[PDB]
Write an enzyme that holds these catalytic residues in place. Structure first.
Site, PDB file in Angstrom:
ATOM      1  N   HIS A  41      -7.640 -30.158  -0.495  1.00  0.00           N
ATOM      2  CA  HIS A  41      -8.208 -29.874   0.817  1.00  0.00           C
ATOM      3  C   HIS A  41      -7.582 -30.824   1.832  1.00  0.00           C
ATOM      4  O   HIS A  41      -7.578 -32.036   1.629  1.00  0.00           O
ATOM      5  CB  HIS A  41      -9.729 -30.057   0.803  1.00  0.00           C
ATOM      6  CG  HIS A  41     -10.426 -29.283  -0.272  1.00  0.00           C
ATOM      7  ND1 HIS A  41     -10.569 -27.912  -0.231  1.00  0.00           N
ATOM      8  CD2 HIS A  41     -11.033 -29.689  -1.412  1.00  0.00           C
ATOM      9  CE1 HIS A  41     -11.229 -27.508  -1.302  1.00  0.00           C
ATOM     10  NE2 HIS A  41     -11.521 -28.567  -2.034  1.00  0.00           N
ATOM     11  N   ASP A  83      -8.607 -27.509   9.182  1.00  0.00           N
ATOM     12  CA  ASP A  83      -8.735 -27.191   7.762  1.00  0.00           C
ATOM     13  C   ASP A  83      -7.397 -27.084   7.037  1.00  0.00           C
ATOM     14  O   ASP A  83      -6.497 -27.898   7.241  1.00  0.00           O
ATOM     15  CB  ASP A  83      -9.531 -25.896   7.572  1.00  0.00           C
ATOM     16  CG  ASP A  83     -11.010 -26.074   7.853  1.00  0.00           C
ATOM     17  OD1 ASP A  83     -11.571 -27.116   7.455  1.00  0.00           O
ATOM     18  OD2 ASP A  83     -11.612 -25.170   8.471  1.00  0.00           O
ATOM     19  N   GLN A  97     -12.264 -26.444  13.160  1.00  0.00           N
ATOM     20  CA  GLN A  97     -11.588 -27.417  12.313  1.00  0.00           C
ATOM     21  C   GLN A  97     -10.266 -26.851  11.808  1.00  0.00           C
ATOM     22  O   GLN A  97     -10.209 -25.707  11.358  1.00  0.00           O
ATOM     23  CB  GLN A  97     -12.484 -27.807  11.136  1.00  0.00           C
ATOM     24  CG  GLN A  97     -11.926 -28.918  10.267  1.00  0.00           C
ATOM     25  CD  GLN A  97     -12.874 -29.312   9.150  1.00  0.00           C
ATOM     26  OE1 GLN A  97     -13.945 -28.724   8.992  1.00  0.00           O
ATOM     27  NE2 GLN A  97     -12.484 -30.313   8.368  1.00  0.00           N
ATOM     28  N   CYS A 132     -13.728 -23.402   2.727  1.00  0.00           N
ATOM     29  CA  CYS A 132     -13.277 -23.732   1.374  1.00  0.00           C
ATOM     30  C   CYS A 132     -13.186 -22.543   0.407  1.00  0.00           C
ATOM     31  O   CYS A 132     -12.110 -22.255  -0.115  1.00  0.00           O
ATOM     32  CB  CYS A 132     -14.152 -24.837   0.771  1.00  0.00           C
ATOM     33  SG  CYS A 132     -14.298 -26.317   1.800  1.00  0.00           S
ATOM     34  N   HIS A 170      -5.597 -25.666   3.027  1.00  0.00           N
ATOM     35  CA  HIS A 170      -5.683 -26.008   1.612  1.00  0.00           C
ATOM     36  C   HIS A 170      -4.305 -25.936   0.962  1.00  0.00           C
ATOM     37  O   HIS A 170      -3.375 -25.363   1.529  1.00  0.00           O
ATOM     38  CB  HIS A 170      -6.646 -25.063   0.888  1.00  0.00           C
ATOM     39  CG  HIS A 170      -8.060 -25.148   1.372  1.00  0.00           C
ATOM     40  ND1 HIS A 170      -8.425 -24.837   2.664  1.00  0.00           N
ATOM     41  CD2 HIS A 170      -9.200 -25.502   0.734  1.00  0.00           C
ATOM     42  CE1 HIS A 170      -9.728 -25.000   2.802  1.00  0.00           C
ATOM     43  NE2 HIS A 170     -10.223 -25.403   1.646  1.00  0.00           N
ATOM     44  N   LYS A 192     -10.605 -38.558  -3.274  1.00  0.00           N
ATOM     45  CA  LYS A 192     -10.414 -38.260  -1.862  1.00  0.00           C
ATOM     46  C   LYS A 192      -9.894 -39.474  -1.106  1.00  0.00           C
ATOM     47  O   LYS A 192      -9.990 -40.606  -1.582  1.00  0.00           O
ATOM     48  CB  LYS A 192     -11.748 -37.820  -1.247  1.00  0.00           C
ATOM     49  CG  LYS A 192     -11.762 -37.765   0.276  1.00  0.00           C
ATOM     50  CD  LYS A 192     -13.168 -37.945   0.826  1.00  0.00           C
ATOM     51  N   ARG A 204     -22.189 -25.303  11.590  1.00  0.00           N
ATOM     52  CA  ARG A 204     -23.021 -26.154  10.750  1.00  0.00           C
ATOM     53  C   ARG A 204     -24.257 -26.568  11.537  1.00  0.00           C
ATOM     54  O   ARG A 204     -24.147 -27.155  12.613  1.00  0.00           O
ATOM     55  CB  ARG A 204     -22.243 -27.388  10.292  1.00  0.00           C
TER      56      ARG A 204
HETATM   57 ZN   LIG Z   1     -11.784 -27.520   1.930  1.00  0.00          ZN
END
Ligand SMILES: [Zn+2]
Ligand SMILES: [Zn+2]
Lengths: 419, 419
Positions: free
Chosen positions: B276, B147, B145, B98, B149, B230, B127
């Site tokens: 995201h 991911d 991932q 992020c 943006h 979200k 993680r």
């Molecule tokens: Zn993100």
């Protein structure tokens, strides 16, 4: 100011932030270049030289690095982490993992040679003033590999492994009987490990390889390594600076320390011979060398900017439609609001379009300073004749009048043959 | 799951070792599947939905995570890296991409015509969960991932979302028919930054797009505590289990917290709205789902073993030649002693060969066992008619007698359909 940093500033290739010292950011363009190099390497490895790509874990237990002896070996040169404490740590190299992969299953001589290749990122901790640009880094990607084979075939392997190198530096790339690189052959030191028999077999095999190579090789007798013989690939700059990029190094220590075994044809257990193989060496470093060599001017395939389309008159309808059409074809993209996706092995070229209202000469110039491999302009003449005006940057006399198709086929026939 | 593990054991997909808990071994077949999925998503994001891939560093100073706000809530399961004999500013490892992309966006001055600007990151993520909280493919320490943006003006928002949904409608509603909709959605507003009426406005635009969507949806208190609303996309399992494959977040906090800005056509600086996006989510997890649903049945596109050739008489030269001919002319591999480089986009198929001496019925014994997608057999009638006997994977009866070129064209027209 380094050439690298300069080209990065111009083409928006790279980024560096204090929040992540020594770790390299890859912008969309640096992305394209990186990923393309990696792709080439992958194809070559898998579909020619018989390597099987695996993705290994980034971090491992302390006990592992203690088993390979690289724990005490790398002290502050390696990072570390604690787990909920086993004290895990981050891999400087791919070796131990690739030994584990081999050890996990019972291996037979018929599986040999068994060759692995891993592009996984590598982290190395160096002094705050030691790392400079792409050459010396903290987080760096390296294309690694390991060959596990019976002594008999070792020569063959080495041969092949060199051929790859020969295809990389001496064929696919610029900047220098007469070849691009020479080789430093590193023989046994006064202190070593492993039986002298296989040692001398190795060294002899190598002497034979280099002897029949035709490439020049320095003897560099006695330097390195206690785990066995090395081969260093040396390429020289247009600036006369001599660089060691990739190294082919036999390792007798890991097979013994990880206790690796394979079933022979005589039905006895013998320990396999391990070979560390690299070509691009450090990918970031390789890109460095490429930068210094071409000073930002890329071969058509590697170039983040493949070509550009400039209409003579921004407000001219014919020219606009023509240019936009050619672009849309060359980029070969599908609408987002659509459904049908993009297939595999379909050709795509970057082909930016300059709509700026400045004079033609301005877009020409700017696009030239921008490094674009091919300049395609459309004037009144081009419109009436229904063709395009195309030129290479590195020559500056071409000016072929070409149809959309002919151009498309030209670019395809370009990335196919590289160059 | 003992399913994923079973398939992993039969197809040699994944490996596990005590020395690296939470990290999955990807070796050659599983790596094939992995890399192929990744390639698909790459092409889709790049040449269709207009995304630019970037590579962010794996290491970031704790200061970054502080400034982002993840150093508070998500620092619980986060992993830290010390590696310091002196300060020791306590650099943390990145569980998520992020903040990095925000850094990238804010690095250089940008304007309204650079939007929507979309990145993507496939970089590995770590993680750290409980030692026992780990499910083999479900939850790991190391995972990849997709991911990505998005940075765009408010006017763009709805647009960017619709398209971002279309991508999903590809992967789920279309590509994988594992079970007239294959998905349903979820909701938001769970410590947040900014005005409540603003976040409520975001919920108003999101509820407004879901009102204009036409897809099934529900509500929930705790999803996406920040930075804003979200949409969680849930998939009903093989058997009676709903998961969340991907998440679409609308973040108003980060843009303000990292101080990001652009220049609108009126030449005034405004604050960008970022989204995201995720589709595959965890690729190990998604891959797990695939494994459970298909059992090792994977279509011709993803299949590690694409086919096999059976020489009904293994000692017959006439049959063998006709086999190896198809193999070599199929895999499209190149000699390892050549200076001839492997081109790009050239087609390649796995298509193994069984020379094992047994009843032909025993070599058919495991084909569908190893889960080959096609079974090619060469008998006498096959040599006399100069063709091959092709048996389809899931079709127990129907077969086709086809010449080499027809097998080639067939396979190509197959993998091109994502069949
Ligand atoms: Zn993100
Ligand atoms: Zn190695």
């Amino acid at each position: 100011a380094t050439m690298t940093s300069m080209v990065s500033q111009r083409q928006d290739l790279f980024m560096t932030d204090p929040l992540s010292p020594g770790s390299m950011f890859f912008l969309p363009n640096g992305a394209k270049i990186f990923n393309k190099l990696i792709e080439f390497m992958k194809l070559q490895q898998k579909f020619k030289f018989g390597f099987n790509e695996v993705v290994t874990p980034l971090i491992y237990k302390k006990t592992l690095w203690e088993k390979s002896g690289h724990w005490e070996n790398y002290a502050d040169d390696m990072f570390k982490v604690e787990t909920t404490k086993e004290e895990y740590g981050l891999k400087p190299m791919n070796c131990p993992g690739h030994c584990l992969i081999f050890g996990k299953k019972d291996r037979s001589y018929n599986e040999l040679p068994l060759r692995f290749s891993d592009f996984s990122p590598l982290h190395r901790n160096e002094a705050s003033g030691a790392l400079s640009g792409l050459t010396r880094l903290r987080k760096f990607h390296q294309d690694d590999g390991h060959i596990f084979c019976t002594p008999s075939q070792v020569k063959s392997e080495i041969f092949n492994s060199l051929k790859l190198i020969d295809i990389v530096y001496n064929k696919i790339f610029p900047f220098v009987a007469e070849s691009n690189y020479f080789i430093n052959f590193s023989t046994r030191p006064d202190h070593f490990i492993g039986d002298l028999k296989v040692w001398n077999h190795a060294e002899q095999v190598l002497k034979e390889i280099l002897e029949e190579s035709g490439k020049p090789w320095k003897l560099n007798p006695g330097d390195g390594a206690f785990y066995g013989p090395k081969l260093d690939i040396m390429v020289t700059d247009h600036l006369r600076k001599t660089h060691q990029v990739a190294t082919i190094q036999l390792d007798f220590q890991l097979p013994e320390r990880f206790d690796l075994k394979f079933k022979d044809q005589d039905n006895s257990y013998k320990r396999p011979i391990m070979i560390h193989r690299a070509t691009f060496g450090s990918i970031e470093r390789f890109m460095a060398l490429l930068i210094d060599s071409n000073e930002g001017r890329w071969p058509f395939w590697l170039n983040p900017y493949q070509a550009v389309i400039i209409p003579v008159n921004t407000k001219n309808v014919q020219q606009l439609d023509m240019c936009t059409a050619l672009q849309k074809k060359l980029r070969n993209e599908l609408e987002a609001d659509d459904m049908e996706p993009v297939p595999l092995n379909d050709w795509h070229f970057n082909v930016d379009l300059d709509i700026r209202n400045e004079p033609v000469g301005y877009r020409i110039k700017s696009a030239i300073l921008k490094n674009y491999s091919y300049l395609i302009i459309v004037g009144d003449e081009e419109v009436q004749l229904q063709k395009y005006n195309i030129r290479e940057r590195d020559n500056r006399k071409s000016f072929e009048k070409l149809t959309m198709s002919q151009i498309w086929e030209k670019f395809i026939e370009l990335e196919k043959n590289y160059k």
